[PDB]
Amino acid sequence: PPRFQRDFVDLRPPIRVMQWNILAQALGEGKDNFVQCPVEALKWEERKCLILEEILAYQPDILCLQEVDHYFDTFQPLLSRLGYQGTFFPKPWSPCLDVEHNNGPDGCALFFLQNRFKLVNSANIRLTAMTLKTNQVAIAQTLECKESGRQFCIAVTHLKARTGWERFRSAQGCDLLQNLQNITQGAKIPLIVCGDFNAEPTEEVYKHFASSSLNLNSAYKLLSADGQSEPPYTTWKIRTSGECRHTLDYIWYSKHALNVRSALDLLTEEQIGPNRLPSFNYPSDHLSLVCDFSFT
């Protein structure tokens, strides 16, 4: 398992944030076409256990998830027993509903440790594209640290997928930024944004986040030598369409208000295996991103 191989890179009451597209069960079996992954490795009982194990390994204070189609039967009750408050917001027209024997819609989930934070406000945002209501969503919550009293905003999203939706993703991202501008009262409140943006760093939506007056940096850039380059991948798998290896996942943070203390490194080509992800020992086609933050 990758959790025995991946290390925290030392980059400096810390707040640990975990970002993960966990792979919806209905999509893994019905839409993704993982041609080199054993079908037995895609079974829900096996996947469920590995996803929980990942969360237990990294002990996050905040967990931001995409492609969650087992929130009500699994993640909400189990994480509640471990002290996490959860919020779930489904895609209005989830692709999971196209799959036989699905478990309902997928969507975003946001969990936080109740004993660490008080919930100040919350918003379930249906993203718009130049006012067009889209099929993608975000959750944004303002939390208050119970030890320091410091407030901050955490948001999670999953943007429109696939080639041909670059301008659409850009419009979505712009709407999200506008919403966060309002919630954080014009960057008065520190911000962390987790997501599968379905976009590599060359896309306009990435450039919008990097140039926003919210003054956001991308945390996993700090793994690079000069701190100026995004990782080579956050997802790596083989589909009927071909092998996909790219960077689509990000943790954005207020550069002037938050410091990154650590980041969980990626797997090497040798460690990940020729058949890539998911596998018998890893439940998603995306690696989890995990960072420790501290207030400046």
Please enumerate, by residue number, every residue annotated as part of a binding site for Mg(2+): 67
Q: Which single residue is written with the structure tokens 């969980």? A: 264
Surface-to-core class of residue 39, CB atoms within 10 Å of its CB (0-12 exposed, 13-18 middle, 19+ buried) = exposed
Q: Which single residue is written with the structure tokens 């967990």? A: 63
Q: Cα–Cα distance between 93 and 197 in angstroms, integer?
A: 18
Contacts of 119 (CB under 8 A, 6+ apart): 85, 112, 141, 142, 143, 144
Q: Which two tokens stand for residue 190?
A: 């520190």
Segments in the chain forming alpha helices (H): 25-30, 44-58, 76-81, 166-183, 204-211, 269-272
**Up-side HSE of residue 20: CA atoms within 13 Å toward CB?**
25
User: Are 107 and 137 a contacting pair, CB within 8 Å?
Assistant: yes
Contacts of 54 (CB under 8 A, 6+ apart): 3, 20, 283, 288
What DSSP assignment string belongs to 34-76? BTTS-GGGG-HHHHHHHHHHHHHHH--SEEEEES-S-IIIIIH
Residues flagged as binding site for substrate: 67, 91-93, 135, 158-161, 196-198, 286
Q: Report whether the peptide linkage leading into residue 274 is cis, meaning its omega lies within 30 degrees of zero.
A: no
Residues flagged as binding site: 67, 91-93, 135, 158-161, 196-198, 286
